[PDB]
Design a protein around this nucleic acid. Structure first.
Lengths: 67, 49, 103, 89
RNA sequence: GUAGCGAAAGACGGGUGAGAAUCCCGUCCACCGAUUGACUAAGGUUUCCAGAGGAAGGCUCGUCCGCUCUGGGUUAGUCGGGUCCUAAGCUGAGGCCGACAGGCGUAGGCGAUGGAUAACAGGUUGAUAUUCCUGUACCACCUAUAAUCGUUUUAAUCGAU
RNA sequence: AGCUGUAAGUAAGCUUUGAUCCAGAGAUUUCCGAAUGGGGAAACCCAGCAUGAGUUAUGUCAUGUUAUCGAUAUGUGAAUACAUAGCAUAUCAGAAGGCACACCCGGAGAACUGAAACAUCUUAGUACCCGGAGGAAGAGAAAGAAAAUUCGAUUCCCUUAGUAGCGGCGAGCGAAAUGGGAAGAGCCCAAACCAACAAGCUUGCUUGUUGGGGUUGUAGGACACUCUACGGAGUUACAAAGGACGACAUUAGACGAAUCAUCUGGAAAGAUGAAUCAAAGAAGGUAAUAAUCCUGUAGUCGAAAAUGUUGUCUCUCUUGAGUGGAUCCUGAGUACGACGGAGCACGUGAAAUUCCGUCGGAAUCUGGGAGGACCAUCUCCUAAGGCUAAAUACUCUCUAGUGACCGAUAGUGAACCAGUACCGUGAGGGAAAGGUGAAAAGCACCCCGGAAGGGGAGUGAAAUAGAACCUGAAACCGUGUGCU
């Protein structure tokens, strides 16, 4: 999954982060209200967010190594 | 160290100090003239005021 | 050492001399399960989506040491070595050539 | 922030009697204030908040088969919006 | 199968239930009454409320329970505390003394058991209420509102370290 | 090729596009705590400064920063004038705390006890406390040890030897040299002297700064005298190749020979019989006792952080300059002494030898110190300046292994829920508790019963193997009976 994230454009990342967060929020809400029935989305969504933050941090590290 | 014993005529021992002869005098430390403790043996020929 | 879609012989147990096909392996305790071998008789209670049910005859696991592969050429029981081909690794029979197994 | 301080809603008979009114009950992070809560629900659900009351619940002791322990402490909020609704179920 | 079962008025009917002197309801009777009453602190920390339960606990019994299981319950600008003040005391940069460790001490700081400080009636739940709802008020901060002081020294106001 | 912790599978899913996993590198890393913005009843409260988001604006939120000492650069400046104290800034992060206080070095320092009481003595410079550092620390190159015709800086081991000696000459304490061995390493300063630099001075001299030079005795160096340097080449101090540097252990890892049948069995590895491999007959599992069933073993092939730290390893090194020493230099409140004490095997005194405090207080190579008071002759050495690897000591740990060590009242306090239930205000003290079966196949169904329990049936080799589950002793509690 991390292949295309290297290809993304450093702000598509930022928008995808908050979109994924909204997804996670709605999933937790419709889990608290007992109609979800597909509980494995939450884990992969969290890991997607982790992927995004990792690639952003190493982008910053590359920028600082350049500077 | 400065510690040892006081001995009786029957050679009973009790712990005891040996204190130096400190005197308060005004010497010229690095900077201003400071008033400080120092030994008489020291200021004999070791330091000026 | 074997895989899932193999045809093998049982060496030890009530079933010995019998052949069968393997259907699961369970490597972390080395107990495979084979069709027609080591049949249990479970007492079944009424589950949430089934009747009470009487006895139930299915298979049970079996240690790997009690199972041996068959030479495809001779259909004899044989151990298994390994051979490297172009960086890839394959299974040999120790009495003949390759043994093909994907299902 | 603004979608992580709110965690779960609370569904009980008391919370439903409250939802009969304009009152909605949430379970939130233990470090945030009612002002953050108000701003968050306004940002998310696009409504207007009137009041927000809040409480802290202690850890409850529990047992399960020679393994005792404590539940997690939880912070509960009750918001009392002026106008609007929230499509919960 | 002994001693003991921890001061005290219970009786009957009806009910529930496998099972009732011991649980629920009703009538009568009796006891505390400057208290066996009602509040508030300290302390304890979910023992609180609904259902379910009788294996263990309850000095008997048990259909009951401060016991077990499941799930719920504590809402504050004005109530008590902190964003205020200090007392005793505790720490205390510099500083003094001291085998080491360390002890003492100035400004200062911390510290209520004291000082200062704005909300009352009614309604309502199984479980919270001056906290939720209604009504009527009060106390601070910010912003627009414009008739008043019109050097800004001074001036109501700003105003002291 | 399966996977979704120990702790199980449901639901959901993921996976050959290489998952879960096994090593290496990196990112993230809430709060407290030396805790360091202030405070504080640890894991909480309360702020400010500058940016940023939002807000009409505050409010609120986020990101960084804000401790004390110290080091490096600055101006500053009261009682009292420049000067510095002190104060105010910029940068850095140098320290704090926790050590494994087991080993090592210092400071401080007991008592019970033995002497058949007890005081000198002993226990003992032990225990405890405090501080330091470290992976080792300490010591260390003769002002020595010894009296041979001498010897090797230090440390460690065996002997010398329970000797010599000390001792209310009691209890008891207790060496050294010599010898045999492990490891083996001698390097630098100050001062003389010389050449420059600045100030006083008038460049004469002095002062101080820099650089050479030289640091040792049957006397070394400077001056006086005489002719040579990378030959050797050495990073364990004394300089260095920082080098192509040629298996970290070649370590995760991978390959890795050879068995069939019958009998009993619930099941064979056992018995019988016939075969095989062996650089592999170590070990453990598999339904019972397996070299040839599995994991493995011997052995072979192996990559990152790597190099074994090993072989010419660029630079750089040290190819010595010998005689007399006549003159100059060769470590000052030092050596040494008196008084009081301590440490040395030595009981404080003739203390010879070595240290602390208080008072005094020198010699300078025709010198000075030691050789168990002191004097002389002889022998050895040249203090008051410093650095130094090895052999040595210990193990909270790690890797690989071993045992005429324990096998659940044993062995760690702890095989399991352990420094936990529990006790105590607190410092602290501190347990008990392992075993179904090969496989969960863990008793469908019927009957009594409110349920618990059971009786059948059934699984199983076995159910007086049913989770209060291997074996199941005795005390103890019962029911039946023969004799009484």
């Amino acid at each position: 999954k991390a292949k295309e994230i290297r290809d993304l454009t450093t702000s598509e990342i930022e928008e995808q982060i908050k979109s994924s967060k909204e997804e996670l929020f709605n999933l937790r809400f419709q889990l608290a209200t007992g109609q979800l029935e597909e509980t494995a989305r939450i884990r992969t969504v969290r890991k997607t967010i982790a992927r995004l933050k990792t690639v952003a941090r190493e982008r910053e590290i590359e920028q600082s190594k350049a500077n | 160290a400065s510690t040892g014993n006081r001995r009786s005529h029957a050679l009973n021992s009790t712990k005891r100090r040996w204190n130096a002869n400190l005197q308060k005098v005004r010497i010229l430390v690095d900077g201003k003239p400071k008033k400080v403790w120092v030994s008489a043996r020291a200021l004999k020929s070791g330091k000026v005021t | 050492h074997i895989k899932k879609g193999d045809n093998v012989k049982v060496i030890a147990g009530k079933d010995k001399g019998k052949e069968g096909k393997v259907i699961a392996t369970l490597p972390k305790k080395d107990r495979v399960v084979v069709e027609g071998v080591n049949i249990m008789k479970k007492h079944q209670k009424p589950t949430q989506l089934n009747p009470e049910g009487g006895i139930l005859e299915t298979e049970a696991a079996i240690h790997v040491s009690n199972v041996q592969l068959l030479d495809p050429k001779t259909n004899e029981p044989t151990r298994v070595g390994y051979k490297f081909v172009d960086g890839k690794k394959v299974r040999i029979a120790k009495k003949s050539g390759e043994e093909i197994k994907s299902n | 922030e603004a979608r992580d301080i709110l965690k779960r809603p609370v569904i009980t008979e008391k919370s439903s009697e409250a939802m009969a009114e304009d009152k909605y009950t949430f379970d939130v992070d233990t470090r945030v204030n009612k002002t953050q809560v108000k701003m968050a629900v306004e940002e998310i659900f696009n409504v207007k908040v009137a009041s927000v009351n809040i409480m802290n619940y202690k850890p409850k002791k529990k047992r399960m088969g020679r393994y005792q322990g404590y539940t997690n402490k939880r912070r509960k909020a009750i918001v009392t919006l002026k106008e609007g609704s929230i499509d919960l179920f």
